Write a protein that binds this ligand. Structure first.
Ligand SMILES: CCCCCCCCCCCCCCCC(=O)O
Ligand SMILES: CCCCCCCCCCCCCCCC(=O)O
Ligand SMILES: CCCCCCCCCCCCCCCC(=O)O
Ligand SMILES: CCCCCCCCCCCCCCCC(=O)O
Ligand SMILES: CCCCCCCCCCCCCCCC(=O)O
Ligand SMILES: CCCCCCCCCCCCCCCC(=O)O
Length: 581
């Protein structure tokens, strides 16, 4: 291991090496032109090949951190452009590396990347495929500076495949656009989880995280023994703790080690882990992370034996409380992959509470029996919600389903901005389209996965612009009571109906030309303002207003004259609706 850079070059390969180096530099030097980074990439690459040919070369023995920090300090416009960051260069390793991480800017001031014309993209993709993909990879990296580089490279390859398919099909846009939308969503979904998980570790501590890890690991690796799960949880915590620090190399090494250990102890962990452990170093940790759940052993008892009817229960618990609780969580999780992680945590928390209570009583054996009865109400709560919402999603369309959620959440928290209500409603609706197509056995985990980011995304916007105390309470409570807290929200009887605005309910003929998406957007916007104006409106009354509006749109988008119809029949529609409500 004379040369870190040479070893990395051999493992990753030239292509991947180039991309990762581009991303790394782009995440630090977020305000340097693309051509600047291309020069850096080529300089580092050629030096790497130097080390590949001879690990005893002049600078090949240097550390990856040292080489990287050295290149950064060679940038001429470094002090002019980044100011304080240039002061890091005066420091010594390893102090210098820590300094560069501190002055890493998160979400700087850059214009939003506008998706160009399909014809323009495919033409550029054809003429200069490399400079086209790399230039965009540079644009994404500089904007999402804390996104794990290898993951960011994972999406880039998928983007390349999307253009390869569609850019030589007759109807390109019909192929490409739906794919680019899928990536954009997954890209921000993956980016949301990453910050959420890192925020959890800092906010609730390692214990709550370990409890979360024990649950999901036991679900994925039900055949694994508790001792094996403990080790995995322990190292998983060490990985995310380091990964959230920000150091790419250190983070990469920890993930690689874990993937290294898991593949070597494959028989001791999971059976459905063969393909992932066959893939290259760059795809190992990624493949394992989202591996399919292994199928649990056929002969599995109930927990009542070791956690209820058994003696020495308090003895074993008091001997090592978190361990014992972890064992309960392990045993319960491996049996219920159909459960959300948080649900298992609620159950474990419940089991914890009773042991603290009953183990102090005269005869603890009694208060044990109470426990498992307490689980049912907690379990069926998320189950009933899923059944009802999916049935609602089945009867009404997704769009109509979004509208239903729209009126519901508007009546619960009318203070929320209209654009925000419209966004979360459409998102929750999309969650319904995705998860409700799963059978019950896999619905709850699916819902947890999507709602977690939607709810945290929601609390983030509320963080910057607070509007409701009730919403703030849910956003600041335990991540196990977050979703339930939101579901506990009732209609706001405090809300004073906002004053009428004619412009808000004035429609023009332009909506007839609007895309099917933004026509819904403007209609859903008007719906939110309608509920905000008269919140005490019933479902029948509202449906009556919505029907008249729907017919009003068809009668003006079907006539010879259009703008006059929207202005005149628009006056009629508004006057008639005001009277009914
Ligand atoms: C990573 C390389 C990205 C390649 C795709 C370029 C188009 C990006 C579109 C951005 C968007 O969807 O808003
Ligand atoms: C001279 C310094 C150049 C810096 C080059 C950065 C190299 C990054 C190496 C990333 C390897 C990550 C391997 C995959 C690990 C994982 O499972 O996530
Ligand atoms: C390998 C052992 C991991 C540690 C297991 C700890 C089990 C804790 C059980 C209580 C659920 C934790 C939920 C968040 C914190 C809390 O509410 O107590
Ligand atoms: C799925 C359909 C999505 C419709 C939006 C409302 C979903 C309500 C059910 C969510 C259940 C969340 C489970 C998390 C938990 O167990 O605490
Ligand atoms: C910036 C503040 C945003 C406020 C958002 C108001 C809308 C709240 C929506 C809550 C969704 C709850 C999802 C869980 C399912 C349920 O129990 O209904
Ligand atoms: C005061 C009352 C104002 C009357 C204006 C009625 C605005 C209606 C807005 C909601 C439109 C719902 C359309 C349903 C659909 O998507 O087809």
């Amino acid at each position: 291991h004379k040369s870190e850079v040479a070893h990395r070059f051999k493992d990753l390969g030239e292509e991947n090496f180039k991309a990762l180096v581009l991303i790394a530099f782009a995440q630090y030097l977020q305000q340097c032109p693309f051509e600047d980074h291309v020069k850096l990439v080529n300089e580092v690459t050629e030096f790497a090949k130097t080390c590949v040919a001879d690990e005893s070369a002049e600078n090949c023995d240097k550390s990856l951190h040292t080489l990287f920090g050295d290149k950064l300090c060679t940038v001429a416009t470094l002090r002019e452009t980044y100011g304080e960051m240039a002061d890091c260069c005066a420091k010594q390793e390893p102090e210098r590396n820590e300094c560069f991480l501190q002055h890493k800017d998160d979400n700087p001031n850059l214009p939003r990347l506008v998706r160009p014309e399909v014809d323009v993209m495919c033409t550029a993709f054809h003429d200069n495929e490399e400079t086209f993909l790399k230039k965009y990879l540079y644009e994404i990296a500089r904007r999402h500076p804390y996104f794990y580089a290898p993951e960011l490279l994972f999406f880039a390859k998928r983007y390349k495949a999307a253009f390869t398919e569609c850019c030589q099909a007759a109807d390109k846009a019909a192929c490409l656009l739906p794919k680019l939308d899928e990536l954009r969503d997954e890209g921000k979904a993956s980016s949301a989880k990453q910050r959420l998980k890192c925020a959890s570790l800092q906010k609730f501590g390692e214990r709550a995280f370990k409890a979360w890890a024990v649950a999901r690991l036991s679900q994925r690796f039900p055949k694994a023994e508790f001792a094996e799960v403990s080790k995995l949880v322990t190292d998983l915590t060490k990985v995310h703790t380091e990964c959230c620090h920000g150091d790419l190399l250190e983070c990469a090494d920890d993930r690689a080690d874990l993937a290294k250990y898991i593949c070597e102890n494959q028989d001791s962990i999971s059976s459905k882990l063969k393909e992932c452990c066959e893939k290259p170093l760059l795809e190992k940790s990624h493949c394992i992370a989202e591996v399919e759940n292994d199928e649990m052993p056929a002969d599995l008892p109930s927990l009542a034996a070791d956690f209820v009817e058994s003696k020495d229960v308090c003895k074993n618990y008091a001997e090592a409380k978190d361990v014992f609780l972890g064992m309960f969580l392990y045993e319960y999780a491996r049996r219920h992959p159909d459960y959300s992680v948080v649900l298992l945590l609620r159950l474990a928390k419940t089991y914890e509470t009773t042991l603290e209570k009953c183990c102090a009583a005269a005869d603890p054996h009694e208060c044990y029996a109470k426990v498992f009865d307490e689980f049912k109400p907690l379990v069926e709560e998320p189950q009933n919600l899923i059944k009802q919402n999916c049935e609602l999603f089945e009867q009404l369309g997704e769009y109509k389903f979004q509208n239903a959620l729209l009126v519901r959440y508007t009546k619960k928290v009318p203070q929320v901005s209209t654009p925000t209500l419209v966004e979360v409603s459409r998102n929750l609706g999309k969650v319904g389209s995705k998860c409700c197509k799963h059978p019950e056995a896999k619905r709850m985990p699916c819902a947890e996965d999507y709602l977690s980011v939607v709810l945290n995304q929601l609390c983030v916007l509320h963080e910057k612009t607070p509007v409701s105390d009730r919403v703030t309470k849910c956003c600041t409570e335990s991540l196990v009571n977050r979703r339930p807290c939101f579901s506990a929200l009732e209609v706001d009887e405090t809300y004073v109906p906002k004053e009428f605005n004619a412009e808000t309910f004035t429609f023009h003929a332009d909506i007839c030309t609007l895309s099917e998406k933004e026509r819904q957007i403007k209609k859903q916007t008007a719906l939110v303002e309608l509920v905000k104006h008269k919140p005490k409106a019933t479902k029948e009354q509202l449906k009556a207003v919505m029907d008249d509006f729907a017919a009003f749109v068809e009668k003006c988008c079907k006539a010879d004259d259009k703008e006059t119809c929207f202005a005149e029949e628009g006056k009629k529609l508004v006057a008639a609706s005001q009277a009914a409500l």
